[model samples]
Target chain A: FRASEPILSVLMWGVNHTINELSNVPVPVMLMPDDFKAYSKIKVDNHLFNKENLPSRFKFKEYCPMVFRNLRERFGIDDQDYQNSVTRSAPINSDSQGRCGTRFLTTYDRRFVIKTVSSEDVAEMHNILKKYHQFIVECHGNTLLPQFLGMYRLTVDGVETYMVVTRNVFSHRLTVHRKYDLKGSTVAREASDKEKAKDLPTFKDNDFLNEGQKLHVGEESKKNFLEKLKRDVEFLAQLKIMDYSLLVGIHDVDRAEQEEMEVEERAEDPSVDVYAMKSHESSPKKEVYFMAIIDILTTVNPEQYSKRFNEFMSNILT
Target chain B: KLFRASEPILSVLMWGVNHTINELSNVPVPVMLMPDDFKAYSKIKVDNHLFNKENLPSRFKFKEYCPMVFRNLRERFGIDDQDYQNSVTRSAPINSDSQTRFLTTYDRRFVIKTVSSEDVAEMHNILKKYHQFIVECHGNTLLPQFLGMYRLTVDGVETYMVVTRNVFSHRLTVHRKYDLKGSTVAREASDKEKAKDLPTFKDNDFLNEGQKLHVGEESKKNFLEKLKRDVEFLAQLKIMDYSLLVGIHDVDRAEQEEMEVEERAEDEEFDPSVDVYAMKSHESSPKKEVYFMAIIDILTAGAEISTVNPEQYSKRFNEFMSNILT
Candidate 1:
């Protein structure tokens, strides 16, 4: 009953009910198309259910308890802390004069950071969060993704919203590229050591791209580069996007940028300098591992929210 | 990488050693991935024809849709064709642009014979928003201005979208929202015909932004009148596509009734704020001139536009809001 205790009954019920429900879903794996991305699996009863006609709730298959436990373990979080988060007091928090929107801290854990908008556009905001749960959660636990513990509904600064729980991206990933030395034709003096060498550089194996040691650093870098490129492309191909654009939403979409700017402008105070965020330069590739994407479910089209993220993917290896 | 290049992944290498007889012979294929960085850009071509054009990325309707509206329409009313003939006011053929397929010029207007209410409503409900038509009202009866929804069996019988100028409506849809839900503005025309006859309707065109002002006073009046009629008709049908669409214009139109404000004097009755909007879209350096800003008419300012139709108005209002940041 306390804030830090686990809600064993509700979690058990949702899981037991979900498994019994989805057991009939013709799984192993069910292929759904017309299935852009809302690949929800539903089952009324595991025995006599038809995959095609399964109900919507059945689509919400409760996670395997072991998988769920592993998710908790990965975040280095405990059950009581999580239980308190979902079944906590002050489901929503609002401010005086009701001016600030509700802030919902979905997960009470060591490494999760997310919030949602509530009130008038509840469905709109929910759709956004729904995607985050679907896409982001799918990648979690299964891969080296942020562990998605769970989510909740609460108020953020007086605005009603939902808060999702997941592991914070804490490290710069190796796949992420850092432009330690900018490369271009304009910089004659700034040409890297390999480029400026009087003699052909030696090549070494198992070397970092930016590191300069024993053999030809340029050749070693190129070899390492080729190896990584293959893995990156293969990873993308597995996601069913022939080009990276299919999986990422930030690339060429129109108007989404405008709305994003508008929301940021409306919510935040003027003292925050946005351009500074843009100006701080680091290798985008190095940051990819530290960042995880979840479907915000806040927009009309699910794919749109996730579509342009190709920016992150496009920068990989290239 | 393999997909982007055709070169052999493994290359042979020959090494010359300084140790004549003392050196061992070195022989092996020094393998390397094919050098293909430059060829990558062209190899990334996506097969455009392999999938439906509308379903392609960057395509308007590529992803999921609200629903299968046309298919749903078919379920509502069975398809039946009724032929009727009436007097037609013969005029010049309306020239149309191929890309937009828009009717240009006030040519001959087609008149049709009497039709049933079911037939009228069925047509209205059956046709897709993109495929629209005009309803000709005569002697207290309504009929389609064009024959049979003005559609061809392009997608075959089951897939029907009106391609003709039938009894549907025309709207200059502006996509400002991320998921700009295009709503039908035609129903408004239907209501307007009942309150006051708006037999004529036309789409506004801009040529060299400043020319919108060079447009004579009479033309401006016609434009304002047509818009006013559209506002009333949309209000009647309660069409809620873009919530901000009809409500903004309607608010100014009804300033006195709900808010208890005095109506504009008859000659000045039309909203002046509309001029401001038009000026922005058609301004020749609108900021430099004060008169241009003053010319903004109130025709669309009053409906408390969002207030009256908050349910239907776009959450993001203001055309300026779309591009204002940059």
Candidate 2:
């Protein structure tokens, strides 16, 4: 429990504690309807037990634990494995920032991402969780939609912080040399000068267009990707969800091979790097592309925006 | 089998031990305990959602008192945290003594005795001095090897327990037992107690039977030294009513029983490291036997001629123990 931050320690403790507790809890034969609305709240108050990185008192509330547990299973993520990834070590802070002063963190293993969200966002998650779960179940968990693993509300020193856990939209082993957050909108849709100044800037649609970047995943892979994307976006559209982006991460396999030679690199656990896809065998340069929809808690003319988002993404592919 | 106790309280105890031991593994052992460590405790309340309700409750709270102190005590007793964890959590503890609802780990390595809240308070009162005494003695004493103490709250019922190393051999079974206080007045086992399979006899009963342990001169000297030191320490604390719990294992009888059942090859073998209190009989003894002797029930400040003050009681206790061994 030697985390750099107290909150991180609490997070690790909470996850480790909850997962072990869950193990004693017998796995249900089938999930019930009320599972989606259920939560497990634990309040810890330690007297004279604060010799470590943890606080003497803190509150951890896991929202819809069973539902998220079912979702994790659907996405091929074992509960214990997920717990290990998060609590095995403290999550490292991501330089990338979320909107509304949100904080971004990736597990020490880089297998998952933790995003700080607003209370409203949490409510919105509750609003769509049932339908989202149904969609995932119906699609056999093979969608490009964000894989929501767990959500929690941590109260430290009387301050409440909400967090959502999801599968990282990039490979854990492979480095993403170029990345874009595309919503198919052109209004000031470009990476800022400040963003471009940093390494691995989150370039927007205009930056992608200016670079004339196209993903060549071969005809078969392209059709499969498009089909999944279409179905996912249609579900989001029905839920009136908007302002989400197709987070694209381009991993140059050749470059990665060279980097490995210089600074040795890595598992081929597909379930771990769920979003990664191989480039066409005949492509000029070997690469692995990671793409997933993100920020699904926002809204606009969702049906129309879904169409535009789909068209732009299709055009970007060869 | 872990956390699968018949009672929710036992299950909680199993779970709590498992959780704390794992948590303590990450904690670096300090060079020495701090003043605050004696007062320290780790508590966790678990509430699950539609999970693991078959054996455990959906909601319960487990609190470990003086975790650092107990953990240090465990180290002093040469008990590895993991080994202790495995003993408790690997399998449910079985009922050993009905009164006070005493439980022994499935492996019989440790004993879990249900105590009152007053006992918990008494523990806190003496814990600091008790730890100091253990340190001074280097964990070599007839007194109970206090391992861990916990509080379990299940369904709003709070249960307190103190864990100690089993005074008897985990492998060997005690055929007869005695709870010996120095006092002889009305201290015999009741007819009802005598009717039990393994009855707990008393000072009068042992005296009436003319029981004498043949542990030879050197073993007797060493045992007397420890007993004297332990009783004197208790006397200094103004504590009384402790009894020297004597468990007798007739090796020849046990061997015969094993032979009849066709079970166990080394019937008389016992590990001193694990069965710290066990002693072998002298070479010229009438019967081949093993003895487990330790001071138990030390928390109570009341007793008979057992009822005497700690100072006088210690004197009487030491004299009786010295004379009991040949």
Candidate 3:
């Protein structure tokens, strides 16, 4: 576990706990109407134990236990295993560089990311959780949209913190040399020069255009990637969820190989890195790109944005 | 022809394990452990109304202790979650004893033993250290591998269960079994117990029978080393009054029986990977056989829980087990 503040520590403890508890919850034939509105509330009073990272007293509230449990199932996440990944270790803090009071933390394994959101965002999640779950189930857990694993509310003393967990948009094992938070809109989408000073800054549309960046995923991959994108965007539009951006992470394989040769690190397990796609043999530059839809907790007109986003992302790939 | 268990406890056990393991299958494996995981636990309470009430209770509670720790323990011990899940959930575990209330999974791959709340409390006491021991030992120990632990409350009655890999083979039948402790004081099966088809013998019975297991030099050396290290570790924790559960498989008798039951040819060769404790007898042994030896009943009252001497117990335990094999 990385060095975490008290609140973050509490969040990790709570999520690990809730997921394990949900694991034992028997799967009903079908969830009832009350399931959506129902929640599980637990008050943990840890006395003189595990105090290095957690407080003696805290409260954790899980919204719609049956609902979110079902959602986790739809996204192909087991509650116990998910609990293991996060709670088996503390999540390391990431630069919460984005707006909306969003703070990012990745699991010790870096397989899943937990992001802090506002109460409004929590409400927005409730607004679309049911539909999002349906869409995930309909597509059989194959989607570009954030693979939302879990959502939680943690209260320490009197302060309440809301968080949502999703599969990391980047591969866990691969080194992401560059990343782009791409949307179709180019207006004011350029990264600030100050942002570029970071080791791996979130490059934007203008930077992508300026660098003449094109993702050579080969014709077949392009077709499949577009097919998935089309279905995902159509579903998002159907639910009127907009302002979701295509979070693209590029891993230059040649650079990675050079680095690996120097370090003599263990080989990457392709199975664990679910979001990664290998560069084609005939591609211009050997690379791995992770593409997914992110920042989904928004209320927007989805139809026009869906068409425009689809066209823009598709054109970026040769 | 395995079907859903009619008994509420059995049904819930099957349902819960199946649900949890399947859910785990979807989670991505983490690169490393976190510090806080050593003390974390997950709990769930379910109140079903008008749904599968026949096989399940309308209200029940299930709590799992330090699931991440246990899952890693399972992995370290080379037990697959799916296989563990299937062994119990594929069929309702059969109630082995009316008085004991222990249930062995239908295939006998895992044993679900009912335990007292004191045992549960003691478990929590030893859990962290036990997990660390298992990891450091690289899952190579004579001690039991606790795959999962749970509490189930059905009809307002709470039942605690601990699941462990069976020390005996699921296929090979043990004509005779013994629960041997190093001590000889009052350590023999009763006449009533002996009347049973397969009685649990003891140290006195084993000695009286003049049974000298010829596991050979290599097997005996490795087995003794494992026994020595395990007991020493238990002594460090001040835990005592454990027993070695020994089950013998007669190879010739088994082969003869196999001829009669030539059905299910696929079951001919039982994999050692699954039956981890089984080892073939040495060529010098008096009988052609396989032996399953594992440490059992390790959880005991000591110090604050109950007064006992771990050092003396472990010393005696080591001496007796070493001499059991020629």
Candidate 4:
């Protein structure tokens, strides 16, 4: 029985079935071009059956089983573990803040995010999957780009659904109080006053500038971070993938320390906080910044965007 | 979505079964299991963050023991992986709040019972001998068909469970049930248990009530022979404190009740192969009924090495069961 509503039921069912099928597929010596285009499709219909948690009729399709399974492993994630993370419990529904009617779901433990994407994005995924896998392999899965975990298609009645799973760029334990969706472009990129009225708002490049938001990581931290970004952006440029933005999440460390003491919680574990970076010893404010490239699922001219994005992000750091 | 109502545990169970079964399907069945198969296991550790928090603990683990051997055991017992999965994950397992915290699958074809960590160790201890016994019998004995065993960790607490073919009929009502151990001292169902609609009575209770199984000569002889062999194997392993779990179904009463519910339609005839433990009484009997008989609780008495002799326990238990069956 699905713990949540029917739509979630189909999602869990679809994921469990496809992942299980992939487990039987032997890992190839090397992935072929056809593997990237392959998909696993299943249609389930239960008559007078389990109506408690799942709809009787639904269709589930997984794109490129072998390729995604390989990518999951390369990212140090076990297939079964990934399966458990998503299907072990129904993903929690979240606000579709950025796109049109696009739903967002986070795994129970918040380790992963499953976002509904357009069919165009699915095709774009197929195009980049091979090169992305190669890039992840070459870099040893150390990139700041959205870590695509899995991609799936679901059908209920006559409607078709497409979704992609990725590692949540945000830290699992620490809170991201002030966030910025920094696109290097300055044209009409600021969050409106209405948007700023929310509990946590997504401020853009101009707003970040006006608010004087600087990620004060020291020289060594900035150097390592820049090295990773340069290598990642270069790879993205090679694939002509662009229009990506650096999702910056700020955590107030002093406030966090006080909250930890008052809440009887332990200090954050840096290892699990993969995206987090501490402020310099001499910085005015004690803070932690989480930086990662997002919106890479789109297709664009990467050469110009990557160069410009790098210059703008570099200037944001002290 | 379907397994979600079963939630975290059932979801994990479905995922675990689906994953391992696919993995096993790829591995060709060998002539026989290697010694290492008895000790082999598969483990998965999941550390989820802000997702799926409603039903599952963010951080948990799922582990499976002796995958190859269990796969072999399932095959030997005529269980299909797809069917087993459908029976369990198709619907939530019915939870039981009895002495043993167990659950019956939606279809009632299988039972998942929680066990102790020590029980896991004990299974490992006797798994080799158990496999040999099952092999010699060609999976014909009345012992529990252990399809799978797993350990699940939720919010840091670990729970162990074993999956087995349910001994009683999936459709028929079990009118009376008993757990017989041939022991004399205080071996009876408590007054509290007897108050329930279907109470698990014991040795003294069954004898005091004058309950007799009438499965006729042929069935009785074969049943006894298999029981004898199975107990002998247990004795060799120095195991005791096991019981013969008996469930009685009254066919006449079922037919009478069937007339009142004419809308229901399904196969009423029992297939000996599928209903492995069921037996019908002789035509000459006053009351026609089906009796389900199987051995249960084989482990846990594996304490003190060999304190309680298996040989003596087997003989006494055998004689008592034989006498109870007419």
Candidate 5:
């Protein structure tokens, strides 16, 4: 029901970033030996079309500035579910002040994250988000943003520069709303727990959170402490049925400084003694949190993805 | 990809030339600015004085002279922008890129002579130790080569040429008359009285010799080089700074000649005429009796012209219509 980021470049791997990568060129084209031959190296010129080495390696390791334009034919993707999707979450709304004229987006998974972003950049017709995802995946654990995404190349003006989108991540994002109560006090700390839950000023909205409430936490607040626990268990179980996970990470992966962290208490019921209700999970908990690393229109080399995937998976296990 | 035809081409578009020069920047230092004037680039004067005896060299009729040398430099070097000569490294206390076109030095006024910042600093220290002037040739056009300020005293009467490129080139040559107007020039009687020359210099001797050397090819190269470097040091302004300069419209020919000489010089640094001062600075003189590199006249007999400073002094004195004029 609430609005958020307009488009979310899938975090192909769980990397951190501030502004989305604004690209006008293609990501490094994989000189897939067989595949490149399968899909010609965009040569409208007769010289380039000549079957001799399509120079895939050159395309893969070209200059930082982007030269290749996207020739990807439009894929009749519908926009009806773009604003709302069941399997995936919706992204943030775009503002006129957005740099590079891009509406960067990320999905807010109900349980785990499932963000999706548009691949194309306006005017540029470049699919940038997915390209960035592929680059990060290739670099393994490196946090540096790629220079090109889709059809756009990264450029630096006086005020701003460009970068790409990373895949869904599980890194701990410092929240602003951390709850504190009187030691051993039976009564709730204050009437306004939501007031203390405000996030960092820079972050418009965080994943895994709905409006001002955490899933199931609000239902728990309505009942007594014990009854609240029962409803929370149901809520948690229901979340599994719906399949949602939480997200965490630095607000600014690009920034040189760290931000303050805050803990929060979600909506709970006040009817029963909520403290005594402890139902150990009968079923093993599956991964419920997710962060889209890259968008759909990505072309990063699979070889580049191995290291990053390992790092991301290792991070997940830890 | 687009055609430059007046008629809009429907087939293709022309390549976009990013020729827009942005004066504003968010960086620490930005490009430098060009000089604002074009006197040197535009003015033309014709000297009237004939040949001088003793050395049989030329002299300058300051009251009337052409900017032929100046124009040749401008057109041949592709330095149509005349403001470059007057431009020097900026001297602003506030850091800004708006003033200059390219970075020549740092700290505003410091022109870069070396890559190392420490070396620049060392050079600055050396300059500061001696008396210096913030000289300029052109305002809008500035140079990265910061001229050092040096102290010079003629019988304790301190004199100096502000060594910066901020000197205004516009009207600089134009200020010199197109002809010997009614009052600027007056005949001086032959006299050996140093005192009479002291209050006002009877420049008949130097002027007699300077006039002959003015129109030669050798002097032309040095003058053009000065203008070219001056402008290049600042913005590569494409203005006709030498428009008023009196000369034949044959810059290509002049350039070819210069190219030939430059080629030869690089191969072997030898050009008797152009290396006037270069020779004087090197080869040792047994007796410091008015030591000067030999001119065509010197080879035959005596010294023809002095170096740049004293030459400029007389020219300026006459130009200002000061008491120095005989």
Candidate 6:
């Protein structure tokens, strides 16, 4: 009925409440200019409804609901489905703490990721949201950029916590045997020994280069991937966004099958694993590749970084 | 997905029930309810900035009175909290009548009545004793089985509502109904009242129609015992002007209606646990029927308000109810 964490419980409750409420509202023919700036806020003060897992009081604020709703539609996501993925169960905690001490969680089904962001990040999101939405529309929701689904501000115990939801860039089912975060820079771009000691550390650019890693996605897939990367990075560069990374996760299908045979086997739903691409048959081992641009809110020499990032990713794809 | 009720207030009601029930689910059931629980309440104030205004207000407040007490009562009445929540929140409650402030859940398993502030106060006054009485009676009484109560503030207007298990069978339609108080003075239905789809007749009308509920000798005795005990309790509380609300479902007539509409079978079968007030007709009765009887409106009481004192009213009410059964 409720999640172990009060924040997670509130997130579940808030999404369920707002989504049901939104069902009653008629979808406008077009999102108005003001819609991009608008937000919905709700404060809950419970006298006795408090339990072990939930607080007696909390506040939930949704930012630019109409704009997000429109974006979700453009992204081929149904509002009801999105609501179900979030509210049907409490999201489980992710092991990886994001950059800058940010907390990360994944939906119970692992189809979406919920990342805590700062107020500054929320403001930056607002700054680029309109253009981001326009780009999504222009690209017909096919770009490699992270799909921003929903954003919220939750006030629990008077402390404001902001969160952003995105489509999980990694496959929900397949295991990522090796993963890397690439920013097209080698200096200090390697996993620390402490990080490397973890079961699944996020290796960086230097690590990927030292490992002599190639994505082996073949010509056709590499062409489409590079094309989407170029367009996505160009958009980011135009927005003066930089220091973002190309997150890559490599899944060896044969290794996964062998591991599952030792435990249990499960099928995958491609629709849910939206970012997954299969390796070319003629290459090496059978594999599934998940790649997406993450941490887009960061910045630098935007055009220079975008070109270097795109070129480095292109060279590694074959 | 949630049932988007027609009105904002109703939508808020559904949302509130859903929320409170889900919250209650996380709480472990207690060994016994404490005194503080009877006075405790849960209040939630939602202020939506630019969302949820179509079917619900952008800003509103929902308050649940004595959540633990009602949760206990629901269990006493053999109702699962989840089931009760589903009945109210799974779909919007439908208006019971065109002119009344009464509604029933979409499943028709529960009734939601808009009550006055005074009634709410009176409810608070008697709630503890009423719960004790319910415990004493083993949750078997002719009095209303109160499930929940709530106060919804929409657009700055506070509205109070009381939830009760519907006395009538959810599946069985009441072909005729009556509101029978003991007193006969002006105790009849008006032309306008009789003109409606399901008119509520009164004591005089019941007498004129020679209505007699035949529930056999054993059922008659048991029903009388419950009635007497319930009325005596009301008398002790100095409550008066209540009525024995009777809804008669003609099984044969229902069968005919169902046949015409091509509805499902099982028209005669009903769960005694759910339709607690319902009694099947005697084996030798002239027509097969189901009778639903419950004491209603026990919160209002005054000599000036009604024709008699609480004691006298209770006596006459018991006598009238006893005589109505064969």
Which candidate leads in lDDT? 2
The alpha-carbon deviation from the true structure for residue B132 of candidate 2, after best TM-score superposition, in angstroms, is: 2.3
Task: After superposing candidate 3 on the true structure, give the runs of residues whose Cα lies further than 4 Å from its correct spot.
Answer: A1-318, B1-4, B22-35, B97-100, B259-287, B301-308
Worst 10 residues of 4 chain A by lDDT: A273-282
TM-score: model 2 vs. ground truth: 0.88
Q: What is the C-alpha RMSD of each candidate to the true structure, in Å?
A: 30.9, 4.7, 11.5, 21.1, 25.6, 6.2
lDDT of 4 at A273: 34
> How accurate is chain B of model 4, given as a TM-score from 0 to 1?
0.87
Best by TM-score: 2
Write candidate 2's Cα lDDT for A1-318 as tens digits.
648877888898888777776666656777788888778888788888755688888989898777788898898888889999998888998765645646889999887889888899999999999999989889878777888999998888899999999987777767888888898864654667577878668888888887888678778778888988898888888888857889988877777777777665332212233433322232446766778788899534667888888998989887
Off by over 4 Å in 2: A23-29, A78-81, A96-98, A138-140, A185-200, A251-282, A286-288, B1-3, B184-191, B259-287, B301-307
User: Which residue pairs collide in model 3, if any?
Assistant: A21-B43, A78-B23, A89-B34
Instruction: Let me know the DockQ for model 6.
Output: 0.31
Chain A superposition TM-score, candidate 5: 0.22
lDDT of 4 by residue, B186-280 (tens): 53555778886688888888888878677778777888998888887788887889998888877778777866676455534342224443322
Alpha carbon lDDT of each predicted model:
0.25, 0.80, 0.73, 0.74, 0.22, 0.80
lDDT of each residue in B146-220, candidate 5, tens digit only? 232212222233222122221112111111111111122344322443332222123353344342222234433
lDDT of 3 by residue, B1-326 (tens): 22368788887788667655654454445576565666666554555443334455656666666666677888888878888888887878997743236778888778899888888788878888888888788888889888888777788798888898777777777767888887746535545678757788888888889895887887788889888899998999978778998887777777778776786575664422233533222232554766778888877412355533778888889988888887
lDDT of 1 by residue, B1-326 (tens): 00111111000000000110001111111132122211111001111111222212211110101112222222222211110111111112243322113332132122112233343344443233212211211101111122222211111221122212211111111111111122322222222322332221111111112222232344334434433333333344444332211101122323434344343354356322233122212112222111111111011133434442623432222221122111
Candidate 6 structure quality by residue, lDDT tens digits, B36-66: 8887888888776555555667788888998
Order candidates by TM-score, high to low.
Answer: 2, 6, 4, 3, 5, 1
lDDT of 6 at B299: 72
Interface RMSD of 6: 3.2
DockQ of each candidate, alpha-carbon based: 0.01, 0.49, 0.04, 0.02, 0.03, 0.31
Best prediction by DockQ? 2
| Model 4: CA > 4 A from native | A1-318, B49-57, B262-287, B301-308
Model 6, residue A178: C-alpha shift (Å): 5.3
**Candidate 1 Cα misplacement greater than 4 A, ranges:** A1-77, A81-110, A117-146, A153-161, A170-289, A299-308, A316-318, B1-326
Model 2 interface CAPRI class: medium
**Lowest-lDDT window of 10 residues in candidate 4 chain B?**
B277-286
